[PDB]
Amino acid sequence: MAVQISKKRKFVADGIFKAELNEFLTRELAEDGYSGVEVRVTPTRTEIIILATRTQNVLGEKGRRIRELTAVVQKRFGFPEGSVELYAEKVATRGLCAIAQAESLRYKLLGGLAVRRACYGVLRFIMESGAKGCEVVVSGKLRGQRAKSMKFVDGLMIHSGDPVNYYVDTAVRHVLLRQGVLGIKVKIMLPWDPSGKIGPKKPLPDHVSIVEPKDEILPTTPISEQK
Amino acid sequence: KSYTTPKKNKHKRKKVKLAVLKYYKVDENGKISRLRRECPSVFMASHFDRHYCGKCCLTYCFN
Amino acid sequence: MLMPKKNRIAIYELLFKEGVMVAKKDVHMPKHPELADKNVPNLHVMKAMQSLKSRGYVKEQFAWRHFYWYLTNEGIQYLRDYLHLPPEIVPATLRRSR
RNA sequence: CAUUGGAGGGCAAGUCUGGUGCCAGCAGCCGCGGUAAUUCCAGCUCCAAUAGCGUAUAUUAAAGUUGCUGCAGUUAAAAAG
RNA sequence: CACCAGGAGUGGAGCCUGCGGCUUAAUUUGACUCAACACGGGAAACCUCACCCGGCCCGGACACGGACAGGAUUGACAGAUUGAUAGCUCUUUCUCGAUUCCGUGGGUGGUGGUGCAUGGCCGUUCUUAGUUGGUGGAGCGAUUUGUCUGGUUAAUUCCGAUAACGAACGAGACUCUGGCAUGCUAACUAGUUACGCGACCCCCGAGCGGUCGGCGUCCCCCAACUUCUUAGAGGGACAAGUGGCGUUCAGCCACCCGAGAUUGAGCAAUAACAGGUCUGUGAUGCCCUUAGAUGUCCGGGGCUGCACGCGCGCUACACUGACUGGCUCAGCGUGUGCCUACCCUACGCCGGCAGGCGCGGGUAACCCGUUGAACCCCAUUCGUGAUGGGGAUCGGGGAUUGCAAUUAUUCCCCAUGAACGAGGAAUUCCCAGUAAGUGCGGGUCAUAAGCUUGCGUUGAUUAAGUCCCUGCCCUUUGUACACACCGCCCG
């Protein structure tokens, strides 16, 4: 920022802005599906790529919204001109963007339609786009004064170890009701075996196998060839 | 905060000028005098010992 | 105060200069960011803009010491007719889907 | 202008609203009212016959819970020490 | 989260902390064994405050009717007034001016009530290896198998019983840290520099010569490399071999290759408790406060008052005490305006230290700092003497931040010289760079640690077994218990 500070507080400022903009975009622009963002900083540039299931929300009407919000936010936090930009993209492999399906679910549940028959739909859509295991849990009273919660599970869902955060793309959300709050959590395996966009590492944390092994079986006895 | 039952007077001072009050004298047409002075040296009036006006904090003493 | 004004009208030119606005929740803080040399140190945003939000011609949100103000399409005509300016809806945009 | 019993399941209709707050009442059985009451008191709405409806007490069937047809006696109440 | 084989301790004592107890303008609420008490960056004079006395401000929208041209309505030295140089509010006056208030509807906000209304959320059951459906199968239903003799492991991991088979999650896997790397990868912003004691230095010394020894002394840099050095990948370690055992099943003790498995830190389940979270929140439903506020700025007091009880606690009970003086020896990390007020250091001039002074290095392998770190070291002492100890209490001052330290908030001295002789009531902790001794960092800040949690050193007694005491899991197996022994229960 404008005080030319060390790399420590500079990287910290970068992360402060990532944080200070994430939930801003989530609680601002979620008149659609929502997937995520990705920032990076290069020489005399700083580029921010916004990723959601409506290019038009993040690309504005005739350049209006996205040339209106950007300059105020830019100069307000204190930046140069023409450095910060938001570049739109609609998630190609959508279907296991657990935040996206959880936000669609938040849509469909704040309207008043049933949680179990909607979570069956969440499961159906993620298994349409191809999955390996998921766990969706909701809390809140569906009648009266005594607490209740419900939970759906299927597939493989690793819990301990580090590969949870980057191999299931966990997602959490609230809903507000005239009767009160409900809590929602969706845990979905990442779809791609290879390292596609939301594809994790190529190998699977499991046994060995054969693609084309080699033997030494056929008789090979003394003769030659002269090339 | 205001733990007290009295907060004696949050009311603003009650102003009597909707009802009749002194602004200018009256006289035969063409010559009219001042009840409290309103000329640029609004009420330029000797409050107690000074000339002063409500909001602009106008400046003079005795005119 | 509400009715007295010498530093309250700048918000409408701000809202037609760009339609998305940032604000902070502090009046004890004479601090005002984003070009605060116009002699309105983050005041008078909370006086009459609230009762225009109540109309719904812009939008508001709280988070992280930063309140967000979203200009909407049906507000331009009246947010102008307060000044009788020309009906311009172009804050700065060069019509680039970016 | 035609009603008599209901509006929880059993047992044929409202996950009804203001109340009232285990308080009056309902509930032949369960339980319901212990402020977010489908059992109470009212408004609409719907259930059941219908000039009817139950109420209450004798009578029967269901009954193989009287075993004549045609019971059970280890444990269930049951076989003499 | 246990015993056994031992010690560091409490507990007894000086003193700081929070929990009850008495009170108080209220001494603020939370929590109440273990999973309430240096806990909520809770180390508070004042915002920080939710508490006890007194006041500004309405940002009470807006619609409707009121008041609206003698304008509805908003300012401000006076004499007052106060706790106050409050135009608060009167004496009074003066003008944004249709963007007020008065009644209805809005209750804005909120540290008002609930965690037992709920969410996200932690503790915690129990930390272990335990949680489901598929087919099939035994059961008329509940259920059951799938999940299991035994070898076998930190593992529900293997073999293996074979009505089970094909399946996962929880463990192993998923990472960091420390350790075998004399070979790999290069930094004039790092170091080195072995090389050119070259230039400065002493003759420093026997010698007072050739040279041997010591310069954090420099070379300007367009010399040079990563032994060491911060570390990328390359790559260790897998009961691997064999001496013994089993069934040589999955493995276990040992030794040569030495790093021999496993250095510890992490990561994170199913049912749920009604344990805690609305006083991390505008996470959040009811109702509540809505102009004499629980919203708001501020001043003083309170969260720190003492006849007791308790825990978390620093300092020891002195001779291995220890007093002054020397010199023998780092890495943790923050380090200049911030999301708005104060960033890491060093030099000499003074008073003794505290403390006054200004020049200067630094946005950090640049610079402090080759952190020229203590307690281990030693010279030194009087002499088993509440003793120069253990060292408060309080007296007398000095500075130092701050709007303001008065019930010492901190710092320093003269000086005050006390309660204490390893502590009976219960109990914890660790069997290895681990306890303990322990100086130093980092969080709070205008003030700042006996707390936190890391760096780090000098490093010990015995232990290699066992469930005998408190405790998980297993099997048999009785049960009127179905909120499960704190349960029903009986005269």
Q: What resolution in angstroms does the PDB record give?
A: 3.6
- Residue bearing tokens 């601090």: C31
- Lookup: tokens for C79: 């947010």
Quick check: A52 and A35 in contact, CB under 8 A? Answer: yes
Relative orientation angle of helices A115-128 and A98-110, to the nearest 10 degrees: 150
Interrupted after residues, chain C (C–N over 2.5 Å): none
Please give the residue range of the domain that contains residue C98: 1-98
DSSP per position, B1-63: ---SS-----SPPP---SS---SB---STT---BSS--S-----EESSSSEE-TTT---BS--
Distance from CA of A60 to the nearest CA of C (A): 7
- Which of C20, C61, C97 minimises the CB distance to A69? C20
* Closest amino acid to nucleotide E79 (CA–C1'): B48
Quick check: A57 and C80 in contact, CB under 8 A? Answer: no
Query: What CATH code is carried by the domain that includes residue C11?
Result: 1.10.10.10
What gap in Å lies between CA C14 and CA A135, rounded to an integer?
48
Round the CA-based radius of gyration of chain C to a whole number and report it. Answer: 14
Q: How far is CA C88 from CA A72, C76, C80, in A?
A: 18, 8, 9
Sequence-distant (6+) residues with CB within 8 A of B46 are B62
What gap in Å lies between CA A31 and CA A61, rounded to an integer?
14
- Residue bearing tokens 């409506």: A54
> Which chain C residues contact residue A88 at CB under 8 A?
97
Sequence-distant (6+) residues with CB within 8 A of A177 are A110, A140
- Backbone torsions φ then ψ of A102, nearest 5 degrees: -65, -35
How many independent structural domains does chain C possess?
1
Q: How do beta strands A46-51 and C58-61 pair?
A: unpaired
Quick check: C53 and C11 in contact, CB under 8 A? Answer: no
Q: A62, C22: Cβ pair inside 8 Å?
A: no
CB atoms closer than 10 angstroms to residue A224: 4
Closest-CA residue to A206 (of A147, A156, A146, A153)? A156
- Which of A23, A27, A68 minimises the CB distance to C20? A68
Q: A72, C20: Cβ pair inside 8 Å?
A: yes
Q: A75, C96: Cβ pair inside 8 Å?
A: no
Sequence-distant (6+) residues with CB within 8 A of C79 are C12, C15, C16, C52, C57, C71
What gap in Å lies between CA A150 and CA A108, rounded to an integer?
17
User: Which method was it determined by?
Assistant: cryo-EM
What gap in Å lies between CA C36 and CA A139, rounded to an integer?
47
For chain A, helix (H) and strand (E) counts, in that order, are 6, 7
- Lookup: tokens for B35: 């009840």
